[PDB]
Design an enzyme around this catalytic site. Sequence first.
Site, PDB file in Angstrom:
ATOM      1  N   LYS A   1      10.101  -8.270   5.649  1.00 43.02           N
ATOM      2  CA  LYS A   1      10.881  -9.425   6.415  1.00 43.02           C
ATOM      3  C   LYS A   1      12.262 -10.369   5.466  1.00 43.02           C
ATOM      4  O   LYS A   1      11.106 -11.068   4.885  1.00 43.02           O
ATOM      5  CB  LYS A   1      10.800  -9.201   7.591  1.00 43.02           C
ATOM      6  CG  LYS A   1      12.084  -9.860   8.722  1.00 43.02           C
ATOM      7  CD  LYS A   1      12.690  -9.108   8.935  1.00 43.02           C
ATOM      8  CE  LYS A   1      11.978  -7.666   9.861  1.00 43.02           C
ATOM      9  NZ  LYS A   1      13.274  -6.799  11.012  1.00 43.02           N
TER      10      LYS A   1
ATOM     11  N   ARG B   1      23.106   7.129  30.249  1.00 38.16           N
ATOM     12  CA  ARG B   1      23.477   8.640  29.851  1.00 38.16           C
ATOM     13  C   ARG B   1      22.626   9.613  30.818  1.00 38.16           C
ATOM     14  O   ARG B   1      23.223  11.060  31.525  1.00 38.16           O
ATOM     15  CB  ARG B   1      23.608   8.882  29.155  1.00 38.16           C
ATOM     16  CG  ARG B   1      24.092  10.314  28.054  1.00 38.16           C
ATOM     17  CD  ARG B   1      23.524  10.760  26.998  1.00 38.16           C
ATOM     18  NE  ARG B   1      25.311  10.023  26.070  1.00 38.16           N
ATOM     19  CZ  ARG B   1      24.855  10.370  24.959  1.00 38.16           C
ATOM     20  NH1 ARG B   1      24.574  10.829  24.127  1.00 38.16           N
ATOM     21  NH2 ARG B   1      26.070   9.082  24.562  1.00 38.16           N
TER      22      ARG B   1
ATOM     23  N   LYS C   1      10.125  -2.474   3.510  1.00 32.40           N
ATOM     24  CA  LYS C   1      11.499  -2.267   3.848  1.00 32.40           C
ATOM     25  C   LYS C   1      11.211  -3.197   5.199  1.00 32.40           C
ATOM     26  O   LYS C   1       9.986  -3.694   6.129  1.00 32.40           O
ATOM     27  CB  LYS C   1      10.948  -1.136   4.560  1.00 32.40           C
ATOM     28  CG  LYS C   1      12.615  -0.183   5.537  1.00 32.40           C
ATOM     29  CD  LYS C   1      13.035   1.134   3.700  1.00 32.40           C
ATOM     30  CE  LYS C   1      14.411   0.886   4.808  1.00 32.40           C
ATOM     31  NZ  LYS C   1      14.930  -0.598   5.409  1.00 32.40           N
TER      32      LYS C   1
ATOM     33  N   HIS D   1       1.035  -1.651   0.304  1.00 33.63           N
ATOM     34  CA  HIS D   1       0.352   0.473   0.346  1.00 33.63           C
ATOM     35  C   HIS D   1       0.469   1.479  -0.024  1.00 33.63           C
ATOM     36  O   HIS D   1       0.271   2.357  -0.478  1.00 33.63           O
ATOM     37  CB  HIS D   1      -1.494   0.310   1.101  1.00 33.63           C
ATOM     38  CG  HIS D   1      -1.033   0.414   2.817  1.00 33.63           C
ATOM     39  ND1 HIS D   1       0.389  -0.275   3.243  1.00 33.63           N
ATOM     40  CD2 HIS D   1      -0.059   1.500   3.111  1.00 33.63           C
ATOM     41  CE1 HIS D   1       1.030   0.285   4.469  1.00 33.63           C
ATOM     42  NE2 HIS D   1       0.431   1.489   4.289  1.00 33.63           N
TER      43      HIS D   1
HETATM   44  N1  LIG Z   1      19.102  -4.850  14.036  1.00 34.83           N
HETATM   45  C1  LIG Z   1      18.355  -3.551  14.037  1.00 34.83           C
HETATM   46  O1  LIG Z   1      18.794  -3.151  13.864  1.00 34.83           O
HETATM   47  C2  LIG Z   1      16.751  -4.006  15.316  1.00 34.83           C
HETATM   48  C3  LIG Z   1      16.633  -5.033  15.260  1.00 34.83           C
HETATM   49  N2  LIG Z   1      14.923  -5.166  16.330  1.00 34.83           N
HETATM   50  C4  LIG Z   1      14.910  -6.370  17.423  1.00 34.83           C
HETATM   51  O2  LIG Z   1      16.050  -6.638  18.146  1.00 34.83           O
HETATM   52  C5  LIG Z   1      16.282  -7.408  18.468  1.00 34.83           C
HETATM   53  C6  LIG Z   1      17.459  -7.899  18.346  1.00 34.83           C
HETATM   54  O3  LIG Z   1      18.118  -7.035  17.773  1.00 34.83           O
HETATM   55  P1  LIG Z   1      19.543  -6.473  17.128  1.00 34.83           P
HETATM   56  O4  LIG Z   1      19.867  -6.319  18.733  1.00 34.83           O
HETATM   57  O5  LIG Z   1      19.635  -6.526  16.657  1.00 34.83           O
HETATM   58  O6  LIG Z   1      20.348  -8.253  17.152  1.00 34.83           O
HETATM   59  P2  LIG Z   1      21.679  -8.267  17.236  1.00 34.83           P
HETATM   60  O7  LIG Z   1      21.875  -9.728  16.831  1.00 34.83           O
HETATM   61  O8  LIG Z   1      22.597  -7.407  16.894  1.00 34.83           O
HETATM   62  O9  LIG Z   1      21.795  -9.054  18.805  1.00 34.83           O
HETATM   63  C7  LIG Z   1      21.045 -10.084  19.176  1.00 34.83           C
HETATM   64  C8  LIG Z   1      21.059  -9.766  20.794  1.00 34.83           C
HETATM   65  O10 LIG Z   1      20.349 -10.610  21.343  1.00 34.83           O
HETATM   66  C9  LIG Z   1      21.120 -11.843  22.273  1.00 34.83           C
HETATM   67  N3  LIG Z   1      19.955 -12.526  21.751  1.00 34.83           N
HETATM   68  C10 LIG Z   1      20.065 -14.028  20.818  1.00 34.83           C
HETATM   69  N4  LIG Z   1      18.593 -14.434  21.325  1.00 34.83           N
HETATM   70  C11 LIG Z   1      18.773 -13.914  22.682  1.00 34.83           C
HETATM   71  C12 LIG Z   1      17.867 -15.335  23.915  1.00 34.83           C
HETATM   72  N5  LIG Z   1      17.686 -16.679  23.308  1.00 34.83           N
HETATM   73  N6  LIG Z   1      18.298 -14.958  25.173  1.00 34.83           N
HETATM   74  C13 LIG Z   1      19.232 -14.111  25.391  1.00 34.83           C
HETATM   75  N7  LIG Z   1      19.585 -13.301  24.710  1.00 34.83           N
HETATM   76  C14 LIG Z   1      19.545 -13.858  23.343  1.00 34.83           C
HETATM   77  C15 LIG Z   1      22.389 -12.738  21.046  1.00 34.83           C
HETATM   78  O11 LIG Z   1      23.836 -12.751  22.234  1.00 34.83           O
HETATM   79  P3  LIG Z   1      23.629 -14.270  21.946  1.00 34.83           P
HETATM   80  O12 LIG Z   1      25.034 -13.648  20.724  1.00 34.83           O
HETATM   81  O13 LIG Z   1      24.128 -14.731  22.957  1.00 34.83           O
HETATM   82  O14 LIG Z   1      23.136 -14.985  21.159  1.00 34.83           O
HETATM   83  C16 LIG Z   1      22.995 -10.460  21.245  1.00 34.83           C
HETATM   84  O15 LIG Z   1      23.502 -10.031  22.094  1.00 34.83           O
HETATM   85  C17 LIG Z   1      15.165  -8.748  17.393  1.00 34.83           C
HETATM   86  O16 LIG Z   1      13.907  -9.425  18.266  1.00 34.83           O
HETATM   87  C18 LIG Z   1      14.691  -8.065  15.831  1.00 34.83           C
HETATM   88  O17 LIG Z   1      14.414  -7.487  15.660  1.00 34.83           O
HETATM   89  C19 LIG Z   1      13.851  -4.129  15.562  1.00 34.83           C
HETATM   90  C20 LIG Z   1      14.510  -2.890  15.280  1.00 34.83           C
HETATM   91  C21 LIG Z   1      15.773  -2.993  14.484  1.00 34.83           C
HETATM   92  N1  LIG Z   2      29.516   0.808  19.264  1.00 34.33           N
HETATM   93  C1  LIG Z   2      29.780   1.860  20.546  1.00 34.33           C
HETATM   94  N2  LIG Z   2      29.307   3.137  19.680  1.00 34.33           N
HETATM   95  C2  LIG Z   2      29.398   4.254  19.513  1.00 34.33           C
HETATM   96  C3  LIG Z   2      30.592   4.744  21.525  1.00 34.33           C
HETATM   97  N3  LIG Z   2      30.528   6.060  21.708  1.00 34.33           N
HETATM   98  C4  LIG Z   2      30.094   6.844  20.525  1.00 34.33           C
HETATM   99  N4  LIG Z   2      29.371   5.643  19.175  1.00 34.33           N
HETATM  100  C5  LIG Z   2      28.803   5.921  18.324  1.00 34.33           C
HETATM  101  O1  LIG Z   2      29.412   6.455  17.434  1.00 34.33           O
HETATM  102  C6  LIG Z   2      29.039   6.692  16.190  1.00 34.33           C
HETATM  103  C7  LIG Z   2      30.157   9.070  16.410  1.00 34.33           C
HETATM  104  O2  LIG Z   2      29.073   8.777  18.006  1.00 34.33           O
HETATM  105  P1  LIG Z   2      29.342  10.107  17.961  1.00 34.33           P
HETATM  106  O3  LIG Z   2      29.408  11.914  16.937  1.00 34.33           O
HETATM  107  O4  LIG Z   2      29.797  10.751  19.512  1.00 34.33           O
HETATM  108  O5  LIG Z   2      27.388  10.489  18.380  1.00 34.33           O
HETATM  109  P2  LIG Z   2      26.325  11.280  18.675  1.00 34.33           P
HETATM  110  O6  LIG Z   2      25.584  12.154  17.396  1.00 34.33           O
HETATM  111  O7  LIG Z   2      27.250  12.432  19.494  1.00 34.33           O
HETATM  112  O8  LIG Z   2      25.123  11.012  20.067  1.00 34.33           O
HETATM  113  P3  LIG Z   2      25.944   9.924  20.263  1.00 34.33           P
HETATM  114  O9  LIG Z   2      25.155   8.337  19.922  1.00 34.33           O
HETATM  115  O10 LIG Z   2      25.037  10.061  21.561  1.00 34.33           O
HETATM  116  O11 LIG Z   2      27.239   9.334  20.732  1.00 34.33           O
HETATM  117  C8  LIG Z   2      27.581   7.896  17.276  1.00 34.33           C
HETATM  118  O12 LIG Z   2      25.904   7.247  16.223  1.00 34.33           O
HETATM  119  C9  LIG Z   2      27.732   6.763  18.434  1.00 34.33           C
HETATM  120  O13 LIG Z   2      26.266   6.336  19.067  1.00 34.33           O
HETATM  121  C10 LIG Z   2      31.156   3.273  21.988  1.00 34.33           C
HETATM  122  O14 LIG Z   2      31.657   3.212  23.265  1.00 34.33           O
HETATM  123  N5  LIG Z   2      30.286   2.089  21.749  1.00 34.33           N
HETATM  124  N1  LIG Z   3      15.174  -4.984  11.746  1.00 36.92           N
HETATM  125  C1  LIG Z   3      14.429  -3.523  12.039  1.00 36.92           C
HETATM  126  C2  LIG Z   3      14.470  -2.537  10.425  1.00 36.92           C
HETATM  127  C3  LIG Z   3      15.027  -1.846  10.348  1.00 36.92           C
HETATM  128  C4  LIG Z   3      14.984  -1.149   8.891  1.00 36.92           C
HETATM  129  O1  LIG Z   3      14.227  -1.452   8.453  1.00 36.92           O
HETATM  130  O2  LIG Z   3      15.471  -0.059   9.344  1.00 36.92           O
HETATM  131  C5  LIG Z   3      13.183  -3.524  12.582  1.00 36.92           C
HETATM  132  O3  LIG Z   3      12.378  -4.636  13.272  1.00 36.92           O
HETATM  133  O4  LIG Z   3      12.157  -1.722  12.265  1.00 36.92           O
END
Ligand SMILES: NC(=O)C1=CN([C@@H]2O[C@H](COP(=O)(O)OP(=O)(O)OC[C@H]3O[C@@H](n4cnc5c(N)ncnc54)[C@H](OP(=O)(O)O)[C@@H]3O)[C@@H](O)[C@H]2O)C=CC1
Ligand SMILES: Nc1nc2c(ncn2[C@@H]2O[C@H](COP(=O)(O)OP(=O)(O)OP(=O)(O)O)[C@@H](O)[C@H]2O)c(=O)[nH]1
Ligand SMILES: N[C@@H](CCC(=O)O)C(=O)O
EC number: 1.4.1.3
Lengths: 501, 125, 501, 501
Positions: free
Chosen positions: A126, A265, A90, A85
Amino acid sequence: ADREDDPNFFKMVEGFFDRGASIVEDKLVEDLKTRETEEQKRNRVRGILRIIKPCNHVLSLSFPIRRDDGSWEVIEGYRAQHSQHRTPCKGGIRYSTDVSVDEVKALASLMTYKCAVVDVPFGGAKAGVKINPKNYTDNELEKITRRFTMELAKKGFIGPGVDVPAPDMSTGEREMSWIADTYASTIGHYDINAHACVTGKPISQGGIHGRISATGRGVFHGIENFINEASYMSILGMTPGFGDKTFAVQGFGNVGLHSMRYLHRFGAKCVAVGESDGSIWNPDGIDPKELEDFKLQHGTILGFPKAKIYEGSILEVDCDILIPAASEKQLTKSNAPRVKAKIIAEGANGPTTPEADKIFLERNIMVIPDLYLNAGGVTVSYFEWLKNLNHVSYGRLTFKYERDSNYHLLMSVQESLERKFGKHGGTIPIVPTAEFQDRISGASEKDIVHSGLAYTMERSARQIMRTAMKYNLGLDLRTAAYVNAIEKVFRVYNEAGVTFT
Amino acid sequence: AGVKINPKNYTDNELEKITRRFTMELAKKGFIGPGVDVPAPDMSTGEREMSWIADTYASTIGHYDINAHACVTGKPISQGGIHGRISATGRGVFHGIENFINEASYMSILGMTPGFGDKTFAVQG
Amino acid sequence: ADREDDPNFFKMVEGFFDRGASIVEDKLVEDLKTRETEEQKRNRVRGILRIIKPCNHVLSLSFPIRRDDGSWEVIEGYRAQHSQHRTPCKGGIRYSTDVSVDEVKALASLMTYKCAVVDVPFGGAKAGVKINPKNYTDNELEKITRRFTMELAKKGFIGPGVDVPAPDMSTGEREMSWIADTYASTIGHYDINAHACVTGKPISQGGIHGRISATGRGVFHGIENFINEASYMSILGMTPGFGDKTFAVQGFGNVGLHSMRYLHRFGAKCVAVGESDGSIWNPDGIDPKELEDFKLQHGTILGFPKAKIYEGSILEVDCDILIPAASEKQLTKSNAPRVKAKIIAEGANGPTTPEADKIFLERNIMVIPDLYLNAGGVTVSYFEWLKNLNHVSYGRLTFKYERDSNYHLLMSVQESLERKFGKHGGTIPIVPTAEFQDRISGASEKDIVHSGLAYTMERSARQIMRTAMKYNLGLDLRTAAYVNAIEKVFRVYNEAGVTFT
Amino acid sequence: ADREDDPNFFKMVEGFFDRGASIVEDKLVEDLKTRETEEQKRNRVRGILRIIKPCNHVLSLSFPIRRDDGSWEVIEGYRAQHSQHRTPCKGGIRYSTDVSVDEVKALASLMTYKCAVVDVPFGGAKAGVKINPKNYTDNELEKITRRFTMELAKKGFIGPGVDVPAPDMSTGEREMSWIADTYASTIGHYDINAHACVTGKPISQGGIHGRISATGRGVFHGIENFINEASYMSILGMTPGFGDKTFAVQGFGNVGLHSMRYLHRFGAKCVAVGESDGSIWNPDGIDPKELEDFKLQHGTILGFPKAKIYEGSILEVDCDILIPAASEKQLTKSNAPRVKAKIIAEGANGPTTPEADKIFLERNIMVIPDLYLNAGGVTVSYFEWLKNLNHVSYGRLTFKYERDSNYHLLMSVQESLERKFGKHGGTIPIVPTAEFQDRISGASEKDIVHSGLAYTMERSARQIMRTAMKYNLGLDLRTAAYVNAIEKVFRVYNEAGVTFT
Ligand SMILES: NC(=O)C1=CN([C@@H]2O[C@H](COP(=O)(O)OP(=O)(O)OC[C@H]3O[C@@H](n4cnc5c(N)ncnc54)[C@H](OP(=O)(O)O)[C@@H]3O)[C@@H](O)[C@H]2O)C=CC1
Ligand SMILES: Nc1nc2c(ncn2[C@@H]2O[C@H](COP(=O)(O)OP(=O)(O)OP(=O)(O)O)[C@@H](O)[C@H]2O)c(=O)[nH]1
Ligand SMILES: N[C@@H](CCC(=O)O)C(=O)O
Ligand SMILES: NC(=O)C1=CN([C@@H]2O[C@H](COP(=O)(O)OP(=O)(O)OC[C@H]3O[C@@H](n4cnc5c(N)ncnc54)[C@H](OP(=O)(O)O)[C@@H]3O)[C@@H](O)[C@H]2O)C=CC1
Ligand SMILES: NC(=O)C1=CN([C@@H]2O[C@H](COP(=O)(O)OP(=O)(O)OC[C@H]3O[C@@H](n4cnc5c(N)ncnc54)[C@H](OP(=O)(O)O)[C@@H]3O)[C@@H](O)[C@H]2O)C=CC1
Ligand SMILES: Nc1nc2c(ncn2[C@@H]2O[C@H](COP(=O)(O)OP(=O)(O)OP(=O)(O)O)[C@@H](O)[C@H]2O)c(=O)[nH]1
Ligand SMILES: Nc1nc2c(ncn2[C@@H]2O[C@H](COP(=O)(O)OP(=O)(O)OP(=O)(O)O)[C@@H](O)[C@H]2O)c(=O)[nH]1
Ligand SMILES: Nc1nc2c(ncn2[C@@H]2O[C@H](COP(=O)(O)OP(=O)(O)OP(=O)(O)O)[C@@H](O)[C@H]2O)c(=O)[nH]1
Ligand SMILES: N[C@@H](CCC(=O)O)C(=O)O
Ligand SMILES: N[C@@H](CCC(=O)O)C(=O)O
């Protein structure tokens, strides 16, 4: 999670949808333009909602890759397109052994409703690849990604105007780089918008500032919008604000880590962090920075010197706010009795089953729902897509002109006052405050992302509260969000005459 | 563009078919497209027909075009329309009259007072 | 459909594949020009067979249509593409409430192997729409068909060089007309080969002579090739030939009716016909014309005056040859003990379970397998596709030249003999026999279809017999066919280096 | 022109269509499949014939060219596509000041019905550029042509699978070369069939043997098929055959000259030749060869030494056969009373008005109609298009194999007789006649153009005769041809369900 607490993910999301459809059904029948109220109106409304809920398209794939030791492997993949729609679909790409058609359809539909809640003009999609990326080399994962991209592109399941993927569990910047390079070097070689084919790209590649931390930064904003509402914080028996509160996050990945960075923070204190390994705990607080340094260094959080290997499930740890930031269906009927927090902030997608919802409602626990709270990732992905379409860094053309304009504006005030209160008022310097000096050239990309995100997270929060009050939904904010999502999507199907979109 | 019918003599079902078909025949010969030719309402067409035109285009020839919905204007707002298109032509009729009705040089040759507060008008249509 | 004789159709066809893979595994490892054994050669072989087995692509669809009453319905549809090792995929479209992803995947894989058996250069595909066409008007079915086409075309699941559909259960000439018109009027408006996008078309639309009856005509040829083999007719304890034999056919549709027309023509006796209604019976013979006339007139075969309503399952009726020409999984383990025929000619696709295969072997019942016997439909569809590519009726350019050539050839012999045996011989007229006079202008399209089909049905039969003898398979001709199919497909994956095909 | 004898060309061809529609209307209603004979059959039939009559598409063009002296000139052009019931439209390009929308639509519809008469699978189309080519340099005509091509190509009015032009009045080999080069160098650079975008090309350029003379060679064949029919030659009061007949041809261009070459070859004598200049005359015969040499040399026929300037209209010259081979509407109401000839062979398109038809009927004058008689051009253009699609010279792959095969065939007969009549027979040489020796390698491209054309001119003539008898139409062969054309086109609309074809 449990057994017999483990519903079909797609039906479960359909259930959330039905809930919201019951409540707006009257309102939808209300504002219909059309002929004669024979409430054939009513049936027309219910026919449109029947069209919205199923996925329009699901591609299932098998394709071979040649492993590092020379063996052939077949790997399966899926991509569901829930709705067109709004024309570019995405949604992210998940590499996990739990990927199924079931799960990919559920997440695709959540993407549709989430985009509607935050008013991002994308339909939901997805994708999922049925592997555990732990068991593959970087060489192997590149081949899997690059080839998954080509099979999707040949069947019209990726393209800047068709379907734009993004990161999800176990994918990131690196995979998005491989996707964009494979697209723009084959099917997209002549497309001026080839690099808009995927978001979450590295900044050096058409990525955008803050996309990595965007989902957690929107988890912060969405919690803050409710933690500062006296009306809601009273039913929960809590003080407004962050300065005194504790939280636990399940998942230390993309969503978990940055959620914990931003709450720390603004004063809140991280009490427990969990992964699949297990969890750690320390009621005095865990520092996000040194915990990240530890994981980067040792590949696990277990054994963090400044905390405690917690035996006994993260989800029941004692805290104010619990942040599920990992898989789906983590809070179940057998689970919700002990949850011990009063705010559940769904950073993950679908982390709470419907009967866990029942429970949380009758313990007066507030669930800030996924389709609102984690929509910061898709909001900033939308900004990245727009950026690729425009082919300029925000502000680039206007920095100098703006800076000069603002000085002449302020000079106009200065000279106007010097004219009036003439010779012996002397010089009346008008100069920017320290804060205005920062904005004197107008917004950059970083500024747009930050304030753009905050604007939509709060505009969306106040639409959900408006809706929850009008239908008297109490702490059932999930139903309020679906009511909003349904209303938005329904209007497009109204004027269109359906048949397709 | 023009279609030789009197739309009062047709059902909404029939007019939809006429419109969706007219669109396809135009699209196959390159007489509609975002970068080629962008239609709009005229006599006896409106928001509703423009919906049908955009849907037919974006679902066939324009399925991969990131600009498919720019193929026609006058669309309903829920569909990529814009605020005020419906009333736009009359709002510009007002502005165009007021720009001359407040010009003393012209209002004098006509023997009239500047401004609107004291004038009558008739509209055909 | 029962409860524990009812295997997963796709897995069941995988099982047939596996038996065939067992038997040729040695012979595949044999003729590998690659480095040397290390029995990495053997692992390479079963890695390639692992790639061939699964479907490469499956599209699942939901889309709305407007019923005749004004109501909206969502209808599901699928199209699986099993293999692209040969570029245009080929396979029919089935409208039935039994349509599912796994039914569509099973039939798509059978299409791959059937095409290999008969040496038709298509990969396998199959589509399904989940409706019962008896509950829809012609207006509604047109809509459903023309939609389904456009959704398939946008995603590259139909196209002259990509995927060419055809009739299956409950679709025919009429649906194929709608598919070709929808394609050639939208996505294919500039394609010189637009009408090669689907086969089974009406003759007036680029159809070919005999496509309608082609599956039954190849059922007749495939039975005749085995019924005239003394070696096989002896193990069965029967006389060669048709003149004394009876048969029963389940299904009186496209396959059943024409199978029964052609066997009746060559002396065999139709003893029983069945549909979903029930069956009819007459040990004196049923005539195919008057039975067709009756069905066209009354919409059922029950109540045919010249036969009597048989109670007791057409599959166990007492005859020489049983022709399943309806759904899959009709002959089960509970069923095979009373089959009471000694030849099972599978016109339908997948009409015998593996469990029923076991039984039929022990009872010395000969199963002529689907992937050989019903391949007459795809063989003549291949001719139709070729015809559309060429844009001429066969013979059109050559009729006159050919007829004149042949008379000058014969005149050369006449004048040569008159020259030698001078006027003591007078005139020695050389003229065509009555049969040569028919071919004097060379083949027409009807001639090509007839003799083309007979040539491939016969060559394929002798390839199966050789293979069955050389591995000592007895009456397990199904395994012999899969051995042949696997060898042909494996040949393409060898030189290619896989990775895409 | 002829004042109040000068009907609307398009309406006039519609009238011819209507009389044919009158006569088959019963037959068409006869063989309809469908359900309700409710007199809704009859209304379907008429609704289909109402769809066939009007042109589906007409492009009108204005575009500028710079003249040789630097001046700018707008020139108008048109191309009508009458029908897409068969996908590549076909029809020529006319450069003349008489070109209009109505003339181009009339000729386009004639092309549809003429292709149906001769069974050429093209829909009708026709283009016109409103210039007098005698007033332009070759440089200027090139620019007009190359540009007309690009404007047609951008709007999908030329293309191998869309619309394939050809010569008409005042265009030839040379213009077709310009069209094909412009297409294959811009829009068609990647199209394997680019050069099939136009027919009538020079042979070095993908043209085909005999296209230039093809229309006249089919004028000869179509006259011969009727001049040797005793049934028809008796109502005219003439002897069968050519050896003793005279003819006059109006127009000495592509159609006229070659019509006259072929009739002169088979004994008929040319008595008068006309152009816009005037006519020449000699009851004693005019030789085509030396008349052509004179025109090439002096640019006019007037003043041919072996004939006298005839003043008194070539259409009323005293002869057996009159061949209109120039413009339309040349035989009018005011004109037909004096026509003097017994056979009017319409080489031109639309040279006879309907009122002139009325007259010719009642004087028992036979009109061999355009949509049959001049269809030799489109028949051989169809061969050229096919040739470009195939990318081989006919016979190229098979000459040697044929020759060898034919020797061994003949040797089989020789050896077979030598073994039977052993010793007292000696050697029985079997050798080709002189005629078979010409054919011994099988057909060339020249052989198929010749025999292919004769085959379809003859098969079409008989079908017209069969039809004229089944409806008792006497010498109204025009109505018989339209009856044939309508039947064939109606076929396609029946099974299709119309809506797009
Ligand atoms: N990627 C994104 O930017 C977005 C993600 N999401 C949602 O957020 C969730 C994960 O996001 P994301 O952080 O990207 O995935 P990541 O792989 O980046 O991080 C996933 C985390 O979840 C942990 N994990 C997986 N399964 C389990 C479990 N059964 N119990 C505990 N910890 C677990 C992993 O640890 P281990 O390595 O130990 O499994 C890892 O630390 C999903 O629901 C995803 O759809 C929503 C919006 C945006
Ligand atoms: N994984 C990780 N990412 C970081 C860390 N510090 C900053 N970043 C990310 O690196 C990017 C650049 O940093 P900044 O320029 O300080 O981001 P900012 O616009 O000032 O806002 P913040 O995201 O809150 O730091 C931002 O997306 C931050 O979120 C960190 O310690 N670990
Ligand atoms: N995995 C992300 C994707 C967001 C995007 O398309 O940028 C979510 O669940 O929303
Ligand atoms: N269509 C083709 O060209 C080809 C088809 N096949 C296979 O042949 C079989 C049927 O082909 P087709 O003849 O086209 O199908 P049709 O729909 O044309 O005719 C089907 C026949 O089978 C009968 N039938 C359906 N279900 C049952 C049942 N459960 N029990 C008994 N009789 C039943 C129908 O009877 P009712 O009307 O009462 O349902 C009808 O008489 C399918 O397996 C198809 O895949 C194989 C090769 C080519
Ligand atoms: N071209 C083809 O392949 C086919 C053409 N036709 C039809 O036949 C005619 C074209 O013949 P073609 O030979 O192609 O055209 P050409 O231009 O090649 O030759 C035309 C001839 O007709 C003469 N002519 C034109 N107008 C008149 C007139 N009013 N009175 C007398 N003579 C005239 C010309 O004389 P001048 O040289 O002085 O103009 C020239 O001799 C058209 O009606 C065309 O539609 C039909 C089927 C096939
Ligand atoms: N037919 C009709 N249209 C209206 C009316 N009021 C507003 N509209 C149109 O609806 C659109 C949305 O109207 P508003 O929400 O009032 O916004 P607006 O720009 O202030 O509208 P206007 O100044 O009245 O043109 C505008 O195009 C209006 O022209 C009305 O009373 N009748
Ligand atoms: N349903 C049905 N089809 C028929 C019947 N008779 C012929 N056909 C089919 O209709 C088409 C035209 O038949 P024919 O003109 O006799 O040509 P044919 O190739 O000699 O036909 P067959 O050998 O009988 O298949 C062929 O495909 C036939 O198989 C019939 O009585 N009923
Ligand atoms: N304009 C013109 N064309 C000629 C003349 N003589 C032959 N042609 C044509 O030139 C082409 C090549 O000539 P040939 O080698 O004789 O071919 P052909 O098949 O034997 O030709 P024909 O039997 O004359 O039709 C043929 O298409 C002839 O019709 C002529 O004197 N003038
Ligand atoms: N359903 C037919 C279709 C064959 C074709 O593609 O023509 C089959 O099973 O073989
Ligand atoms: N002008 C020719 C052209 C035929 C062709 O398309 O080759 C005719 O009237 O038939």
